[PDB]
Write an enzyme that holds these catalytic residues in place. Structure first.
Site, short mmCIF file in Angstrom:
data_model
loop_
_atom_site.label_atom_id
_atom_site.label_comp_id
_atom_site.label_asym_id
_atom_site.label_seq_id
_atom_site.Cartn_x
_atom_site.Cartn_y
_atom_site.Cartn_z
N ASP A 46 0.78 -1.23 0.00
CA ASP A 46 0.00 0.00 0.00
C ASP A 46 0.82 1.29 0.00
O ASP A 46 1.31 1.69 1.05
CB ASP A 46 -0.96 -0.02 1.21
CG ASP A 46 -1.97 1.12 1.27
OD1 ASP A 46 -2.23 1.75 0.22
OD2 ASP A 46 -2.58 1.31 2.34
N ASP A 80 -1.52 5.70 -5.35
CA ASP A 80 -1.98 4.75 -4.32
C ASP A 80 -2.23 3.31 -4.78
O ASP A 80 -3.31 3.01 -5.26
CB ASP A 80 -3.28 5.33 -3.69
CG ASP A 80 -3.73 4.58 -2.46
OD1 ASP A 80 -3.04 3.62 -2.07
OD2 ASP A 80 -4.82 4.94 -1.91
C1 SI5 Z 1 -3.25 7.69 5.94
N1 SI5 Z 1 -4.06 6.51 6.19
C2 SI5 Z 1 -4.43 5.57 5.31
C3 SI5 Z 1 -5.22 4.65 5.98
C4 SI5 Z 1 -5.86 3.42 5.42
C5 SI5 Z 1 -6.77 3.72 4.23
C6 SI5 Z 1 -7.29 2.43 3.58
C7 SI5 Z 1 -8.13 2.63 2.32
S1 SI5 Z 1 -7.16 3.33 0.96
C8 SI5 Z 1 -5.53 2.74 1.23
N2 SI5 Z 1 -4.65 3.18 0.31
N3 SI5 Z 1 -5.15 2.01 2.25
C9 SI5 Z 1 -6.10 1.45 3.26
C10 SI5 Z 1 -6.58 0.03 2.86
C11 SI5 Z 1 -6.23 -0.47 1.61
C12 SI5 Z 1 -6.62 -1.73 1.19
C13 SI5 Z 1 -7.37 -2.49 2.05
F1 SI5 Z 1 -7.80 -3.69 1.62
C14 SI5 Z 1 -7.73 -2.07 3.31
C15 SI5 Z 1 -7.34 -0.81 3.67
F2 SI5 Z 1 -7.75 -0.34 4.88
C16 SI5 Z 1 -5.18 1.30 4.52
O1 SI5 Z 1 -4.77 2.56 5.07
C17 SI5 Z 1 -5.27 5.14 7.35
N4 SI5 Z 1 -4.58 6.26 7.47
#
Ligand code: SI5
Length: 376
Positions: free
Chosen positions: A37, A224
């Site tokens: 990620d 991303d």
């Molecule tokens: C800054 N920040 C990101 C976050 C989160 C946002 C989410 C959704 S979008 C993403 N790119 N990663 C995440 C994410 C990506 C894929 C997934 F299967 C589950 C997830 F939660 C993880 O980090 C929390 N604080």
């Protein structure tokens, strides 16, 4: 510099469930599949027997585990995870031949975080400390990797696309020249938090959207790998859809399709790719008044779900998100050492005999600094 055979094809996944890499944590090593990620900054792994998980981190079995005696609480738009901070030894079997001591959030509770049916049990946040939870003092994995070893401060991603299996490569500490064709074109990382970039122009089949360029980056534009879609600020999505609907007018589709509320189908092998327009994003280049453009095909933005598809461009309230819809057309170099991101045509992108994804330049673009959004 220039060839990394052992890291080629080290990514796997399932359509819409993200790309994962194999990792080991602890002593003796515990193997886990970890989602890659670039949109976050924590290394966080399941550490309790959640039903959806194939496996999980068992801290009681690791002699190298060290407790940080601190919790972490991470709510986000679509879900939440919480855990207990600690450190342990981490390696990447199909990566550099090194072992590092890294921070690890042992996930003890979560909601809508893990995916029912996926093959991964944790997440590797590759972005910068500024956005790490609980705060920037929690050193991200890649920063620990660069601090403790001679691994260069760069990684690159080739996300290949096609529940159908997906694959790709994460080259840690370098670039593999076999993964791309043509030249790499670099855009500056605006600020080290997310991998923030500046979009300076948008064209649909070479037809400029003609919007004030600040709209393209309202309130940020990021690269991303943890997001599937190309997400666009609402006003930009509105203009892009209007233009895509106009270019594709020889076939009409319901309003729900453009909003992702419905699918569209054609008799298997007859998809009219030719009626869908190419989408170009011009990015800020390395030199004053110079830009380049990246162009994607409907093969990237119409995602397979009789051949059925979902429209994978959607509206955002968090700015542009260059997710897998963009990344699958290109080899993407996160050149952290030079604060820049490189794009080149991917040697694995899906195309046809008429059109291919493209990375072209240089172009003359004035007032590019004005495209960046600033909070008043
Ligand atoms: C800054 N920040 C990101 C976050 C989160 C946002 C989410 C959704 S979008 C993403 N790119 N990663 C995440 C994410 C990506 C894929 C997934 F299967 C589950 C997830 F939660 C993880 O980090 C929390 N604080």
């Amino acid at each position: 510099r220039g060839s990394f055979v052992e890291m080629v094809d080290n990514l796997r996944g399932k359509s819409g469930q993200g790309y994962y890499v194999e990792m080991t944590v602890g002593s003796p090593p515990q193997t886990l599949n970890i989602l890659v990620d670039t949109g976050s900054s924590n290394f966080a792994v399941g550490a309790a027997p959640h039903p959806f998980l194939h496996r999980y981190y068992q801290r009681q079995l690791s002699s190298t585990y060290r407790d940080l005696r601190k919790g972490v609480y991470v709510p986000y738009t679509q879900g939440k995870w919480e855990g207990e901070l600690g450190t342990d030894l981490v390696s990447i079997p199909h990566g550099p031949n090194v072992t590092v001591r890294a921070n690890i959030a042992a996930i003890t509770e979560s909601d809508k975080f893990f995916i029912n049916g996926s093959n991964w049990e944790g997440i590797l946040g590759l972005a910068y400390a500024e956005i790490a939870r609980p705060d920037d003092s929690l050193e991200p994995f890649f920063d620990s990797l660069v601090k403790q070893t001679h691994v260069p401060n760069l990684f690159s991603l080739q996300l290949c696309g096609a529940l159908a299996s997906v694959g790709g490569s994460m080259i840690i500490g370098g670039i593999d020249h076999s993964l791309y064709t043509g030249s790499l074109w670099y855009t500056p990382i605006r600020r080290e938090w997310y991998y923030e970039v500046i979009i300076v122009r948008v064209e649909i089949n070479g037809q400029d959207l003609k919007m004030d360029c600040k709209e393209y980056n309202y309130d940020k534009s990021i690269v991303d790998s943890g997001t599937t879609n190309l997400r666009l600020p609402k006003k930009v999505f509105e203009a892009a859809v209007k233009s895509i609907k106009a270019a594709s007018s020889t076939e009409k589709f319901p309003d729900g399709f453009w909003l992702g509320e419905q699918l569209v189908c054609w008799q298997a092998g007859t998809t009219p790719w030719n009626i869908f327009p190419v989408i170009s994003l011009y990015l800020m280049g390395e030199v004053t008044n110079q830009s380049f453009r990246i162009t994607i095909l409907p093969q990237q933005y119409l995602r397979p779900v009789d051949d059925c598809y979902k429209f994978a461009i959607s509206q955002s309230s968090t700015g542009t998100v260059m997710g897998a819809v963009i990344m699958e057309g290109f080899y993407v170099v996160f050149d952290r050492a030079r604060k820049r991101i490189g794009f080149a045509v991917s040697a694995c992108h899906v195309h046809d005999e008429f059109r291919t994804a493209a990375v072209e330049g240089p172009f003359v673009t004035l007032d590019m600094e004005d495209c960046g959004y600033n909070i008043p």
